[PDB]
Design a protein around this ligand. Sequence first.
Ligand code: CA
Ligand code: NA
Lengths: 281, 63
Amino acid sequence: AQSVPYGVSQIKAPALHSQGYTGSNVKVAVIDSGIDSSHPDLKVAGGASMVPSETNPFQDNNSHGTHVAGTVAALNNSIGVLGVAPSASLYAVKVLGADGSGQYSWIINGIEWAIANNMDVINMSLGGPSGSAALKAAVDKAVASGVVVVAAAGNEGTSGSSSTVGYPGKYPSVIAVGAVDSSNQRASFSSVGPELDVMAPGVSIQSTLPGNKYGAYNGTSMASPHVAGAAALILSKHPNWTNTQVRSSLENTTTKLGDSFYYGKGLINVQAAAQHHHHHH
Amino acid sequence: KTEWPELVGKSVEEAKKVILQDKPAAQIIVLPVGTIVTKEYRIDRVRLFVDRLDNIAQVPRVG
Ligand SMILES: [Ca+2]
Ligand code: NA
């Protein structure tokens, strides 16, 4: 039997599934460490690797990209977990190696591949404390081209009144996602600052791991793909909505939590986002 | 103890030694400063970001 991880229920994804919308024909690039395409609870539609020494995007030598991918799009069947957008067209864009790191140019190359291949949504469960002009130009280009771009806020916790949101999350064009637990409390590691946009579940998140395994991970990395999957659900119900409209639908319908410095606009609610008329619950 | 600001500007060797005294089961990975990395949170992990001289370039923290 299949299990529905709590975070998928928490953002109200089953309400979209029951309306008949599961992310069909929406192209989501997971820009990450690869995705294990042999996992029976994933279907990978395509991809490319920008990692010079690891040329196969369908081999995930870290595990992280496979876990993130399962939160976006684990298949709806009788096994494993269920993804937020289980019918989405999933693309493995490998820009991080086995050790979980990549050069800025590899990330930029992956973003460029996503634009050239007409991705609808990019998820980036990755970050660093500094930006670059070239990084900012790549994300701004993707957004100008129509792509919904979602990233982890970072796991830097608090630092007084300073923002601790990393890049590319920190760029205005990117939706930066923080992490809450099942009681809607901010995870202590979740980055903070006025650049924090929305929150999603990021504590003890069950998903797919390489070699036909499953496990619970923690991180803003786990929160980001709930939002990238929610964007795919919204586009499957409203295929002509722009990235501008998908982003506002998510921002305008959150359940507000605490102060925006710590919680941004609150927890996403994909049921409310996918309605025509939007308000907070 | 989850951050080591006193280690910035020290050698990667001294930083490893000090972190392992405070956290003997730490999984330490050395990475170049100015890379982008995965954003999962691993309580056992300490990433050390080094400059091209192999000195610590950013405050080490658990995660
Ligand atoms: Ca399944
Ligand atoms: Na942003």
